[PDB]
Amino acid sequence: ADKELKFLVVDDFSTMRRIVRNLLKELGFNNVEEAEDGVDALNKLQAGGYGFVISCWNMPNMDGLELLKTIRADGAMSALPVLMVIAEAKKENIIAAAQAGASGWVVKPFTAATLEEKLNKIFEKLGM
């Protein structure tokens, strides 16, 4: 939709959340809040108002795969766009994420150019 759309960036590595927040800012997305894990993420999401989730796969307590499922199973937000950030281009991971209904996915480290594209393609699908 509009670059006002609220993003939730979830990762337990503060440095990486700052990176994605920076890349998003660079792309014009200034509505960004962070979450430090799947549970924190879910607490914030149920509080309603978010339009996009960018999440790490390898996270303690509740990984991004678990977080994505919960999201997709939640009638209130089952259609929420979710971009999965993965540490490697592993086929296992990529498929198990597309399966759980990931809107898209990227391999860290990534650039603004790649993030921009991924985000565009996704906004295309969901006609946003």
Strands 7-10 and 52-56: parallel
Residue spans of alpha helices (H) in the chain: 14-26, 38-46, 64-72, 91-99, 112-125
Task: Tell me the CATH number at 14.
Answer: 3.40.50.2300
Q: Measured between alpha carbons, how far is 41 from 53 in angstroms, rounded to an integer?
A: 9
Q: Tell me the CB-side half-sphere exposure of residue 6, using CA atoms within 13 A.
A: 9
Output the DSSP codes for 101-126.
T-SEEEESS--HHHHHHHHHHHHHHT
Cα dihedral 26→107→119→7 (10° resolution) = -70
Report the domain count for the chain: 1
* Contact (Cβ atoms closer than 8 angstroms) between residue 73 and residue 102: no
- Give me the domain span that covers residue 127: 1-128
Q: What is the gyration radius of the CA atoms in the chain, in angstroms?
A: 13
